[PDB]
Amino acid sequence: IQRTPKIQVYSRHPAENGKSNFLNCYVSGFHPSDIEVDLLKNGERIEKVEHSDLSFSKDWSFYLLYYTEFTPTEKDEYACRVNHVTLSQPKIVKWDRD
Amino acid sequence: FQGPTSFHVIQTSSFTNSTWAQTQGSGWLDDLQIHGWDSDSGTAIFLKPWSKGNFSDKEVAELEEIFRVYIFGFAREVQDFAGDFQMKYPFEIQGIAGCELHSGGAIVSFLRGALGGLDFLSVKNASCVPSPEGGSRAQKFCALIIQYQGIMETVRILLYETCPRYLLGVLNAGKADLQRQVKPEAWLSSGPSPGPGRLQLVCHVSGFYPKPVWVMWMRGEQEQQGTQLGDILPNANWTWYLRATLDVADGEAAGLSCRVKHSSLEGQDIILYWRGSGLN
């Protein structure tokens, strides 16, 4: 059996419009390990994103952390987009400070 | 002492087809990465200045070479025996091995393997123990590997003789980072409405290290048992993030506060007060 990824999107610091922060996307609970993760700004892929080396939990499910600097604003939207063999389409989870 | 109490290495070997397999590896103190494995060079990446613990450069290079030969050899042998073990591509094997320091001072070693995301084997008492999830294939694997001269012995040495001294030396060598205290910050927000006439309040706690933390929704000095702790999530640069939520009726949110305790705060808890009507 294959396991689909759980996707959690959160900021490092409380959102303050115009203040630099870090956007995190934690992808976990998936199997097999091959996966594609992008962070998006207003539907567009963010070019400079960092990520952890592969790890896995006690139940053998994989997990990764993707992150990047970002400056929240009232209008701009951010998200995490994931592709995996268990998904027929990319799964998008939006960042929501509220 | 605070911070991690265990060391382990992991392996993820992804077999795409009969002529292509790749391995990813790394070394960890609990869930803090201290080693990377560079497949371009067949050598390790030392992520902290103290990642070699108290080992000499010569012993470290010997271990890197053991792991380089093992990674190559593992893929070679799995591909050769894949047909006899009725393997269907693609497949993925995982391994974890290491040791941990327990209360009372004993150091316990472990080695576990998985196929298809399910337990396949473990090493208990320097012996290969097939896992029931692994079926006849794991029984066949254990009977085959224990005949390998050198492998059994090398695994025994690494688990029960090299790992315990490595662990103690690296917990000591890294203590400036491993036993540091980093203070959390906390803030409040709304959560998704659980339903009609109900609200969810969220207490966010971020940037703390070490991982043990205490967060609770309160009414005065009364701890709200309905507080729901989220799973601890990572931040980059060895700190953590946690959400504590409370589902309440619209008219029962006033009077709530969130209290945070952490080892770094020297007994000075953070208290946040929820104010209604859009007053934060």
Ligand SMILES: *[C@@H]1O[C@H](CO[C@@H]2O[C@@H](C)[C@@H](O)[C@@H](O)[C@@H]2O)[C@@H](O[C@@H]2O[C@H](CO)[C@@H](O[C@@H]3O[C@H](CO[C@H]4O[C@H](CO)[C@@H](O)[C@H](O)[C@@H]4O)[C@@H](O)[C@H](O[C@H]4O[C@H](CO)[C@@H](O)[C@H](O)[C@@H]4O)[C@@H]3O)[C@H](O)[C@H]2NC(C)=O)[C@H](O[C@@H]2O[C@@H](C)[C@@H](O)[C@@H](O)[C@@H]2O)[C@H]1NC(C)=O
């Ligand atoms: C990396 O560090 C390891 C841990 O070091 C200790 O802890 C760190 C945090 C610092 O505080 C260090 O200052 C401190 O040493 C080193 O491993 C440890 O080495 C010591 C020797 O230096 C060794 O002590 C010996 O232990 C044996 C008994 O061991 C058996 O029994 C115990 C239980 O009682 C059991 O736990 C063990 O597993 C064994 O089954 C004892 O016979 C020795 O006595 C002799 O020497 C002492 C003086 O040292 C003398 O007073 C006596 O009269 C007698 O001659 C001695 O007490 C620790 O057991 C060992 N710990 C572990 C878990 O292995 C490590 O040292 C290297 O490996 C050692 C195994 C040994 O070969 C050393 O010579 C090596 O340098 C160090 N370096 C590396 C590269 O690993």
Ligand SMILES: *[C@@H]1O[C@H](CO[C@@H]2O[C@@H](C)[C@@H](O)[C@@H](O)[C@@H]2O)[C@@H](O[C@@H]2O[C@H](CO)[C@@H](O[C@@H]3O[C@H](CO)[C@@H](O)[C@H](O[C@H]4O[C@H](CO)[C@@H](O)[C@H](O)[C@@H]4O)[C@@H]3O)[C@H](O)[C@H]2NC(C)=O)[C@H](O)[C@H]1NC(C)=O
């Ligand atoms: C925990 O582990 C110990 C130690 O195991 C030994 O060392 C490890 C490093 C590893 O290499 C092991 O493979 C190795 O055995 C266990 O103690 C041993 O227990 C075994 C039985 O499991 C004993 O084996 C017997 O040895 C006889 C010679 O001394 C030999 O005549 C026996 O052969 C007959 O039975 C076997 C099946 O058991 C069969 O294959 C043969 O063909 C023949 O019929 C048998 O090999 C060892 O002597 C023990 N070694 C020592 C030093 O005590 C220990 O039992 C284990 N504990 C638990 C509870 O699992």
Ligand SMILES: *[C@@H]1O[C@H](CO[C@@H]2O[C@@H](C)[C@@H](O)[C@@H](O)[C@@H]2O)[C@@H](O[C@@H]2O[C@H](CO)[C@@H](O)[C@H](O)[C@H]2NC(C)=O)[C@H](O[C@@H]2O[C@@H](C)[C@@H](O)[C@@H](O)[C@@H]2O)[C@H]1NC(C)=O
């Ligand atoms: C055996 O499998 C390889 C497939 O690897 C790619 O990465 C896997 C992790 C997985 O994502 C899979 O879907 C991918 O296809 C092939 O090698 C790769 O081939 C592609 C061409 O499709 C090429 O872009 C890659 O550089 C190449 N990688 C490496 C490291 O070689 C094998 O393909 C054969 O070898 C290639 C070099 C090329 O000559 C190709 O035409 C060959 O078929 C796969 N081999 C077989 C027999 O299936």
Ligand SMILES: [Cl-]
């Ligand atoms: Cl390699």
Ligand code: NA
């Ligand atoms: Na990871």
Ligand code: NA
């Ligand atoms: Na209040």
